[PDB]
């Protein structure tokens, strides 16, 4: 209906609680493996944030996997930074990690992150 | 880190995608039964929005149930309105549904919704 009222902080409060569930390992249903590192997460949050995970978990066979192995070129710290961004809206972008974050965001199909990485790199040229 | 940048629309965009997954029945993992009506949802979104579902799905036995039956006094339309609010931040509050929405929000432990229902009722007294 068009007569709805809206609670401004709702989406942010939901994301905060999803991050609290992730921190406590509650109802996490997939482990993402990035070389030697493992990251537990919720498939729905991954799909909601990434074109790659949206494609993976809508596949009729991959939707049922409990472990997903990423390409060995993917940097675990870059993945960790992006996983934290998925669950908090905050991206820890630094001179020392920007190339890895951008490469990981291109692989994960997270265009908005790729765009801000490109802008930050271009400003330092 | 304290040097993060933030994408303002991220939380809202995540919630929009969770609602699209719900509409398409993708990765839904529980059916909530409210008298004769059934509602498919994601357990993590329910927990992130409701004190009752947070308690239910953190219980070591109930976390594994695929069906949850609500109290027979709960109005299905009231539940539907609140489930839509969980997934969109929009509450379809109307003169004809406010008492049922408020009763359902009290049962679901959604205080912010209870508070706005009380304010709207008080304004019409």
């Amino acid at each position: 209906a068009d007569s709805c009222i809206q609670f401004t902080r709702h989406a942010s409060d939901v994301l905060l609680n999803l991050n609290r569930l992730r921190s406590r390992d509650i109802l996490t249903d997939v482990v993402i493996v990035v070389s030697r590192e493992q990251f537990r997460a919720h498939k729905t949050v991954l799909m909601a944030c990434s074109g790659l995970f949206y494609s993976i978990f809508t596949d009729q066979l991959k939707c049922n996997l409990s472990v997903i192995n990423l390409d060995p070129e993917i940097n675990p710290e870059g993945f960790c930074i992006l996983l934290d961004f998925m669950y908090t809206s905050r991206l820890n972008l630094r001179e020392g990690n920007i190339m890895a974050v951008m490469a990981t965001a291109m692989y994960l199909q997270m265009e908005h992150v790729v765009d801000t990485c490109r802008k930050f790199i271009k400003a330092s040229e | 880190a304290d040097s993060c940048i933030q994408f303002t629309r991220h939380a809202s965009d995540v919630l929009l995608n969770l609602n699209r997954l719900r509409s398409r029945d993708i990765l839904t993992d529980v059916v909530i039964v409210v008298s004769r009506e059934q509602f498919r949802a994601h357990k993590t979104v329910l927990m992130a929005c409701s004190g009752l579902f947070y308690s239910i799905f953190t219980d070591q036995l109930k976390c594994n149930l695929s069906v949850i039956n609500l109290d027979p006094e709960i109005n299905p339309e009231g539940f539907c309105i609140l489930l839509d609010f969980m997934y969109t931040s929009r509450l379809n509050l109307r003169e004809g549904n406010i008492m049922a929405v408020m009763a359902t929000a009290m049962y679901l432990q959604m205080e912010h919704v209870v508070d706005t229902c009380r304010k709207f009722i008080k304004a019409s007294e």
């Binding site: 709805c4 009222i5 809206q6 609670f7 401004t8 902080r9 | 931040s89 929009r90 509450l91 912010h112 706005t116």
Partner: peptide, 5 residues
């Protein structure tokens, strides 16, 4: 909070 969206 609440607003008219």
């Amino acid at each position: 909070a609440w607003v008219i969206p």
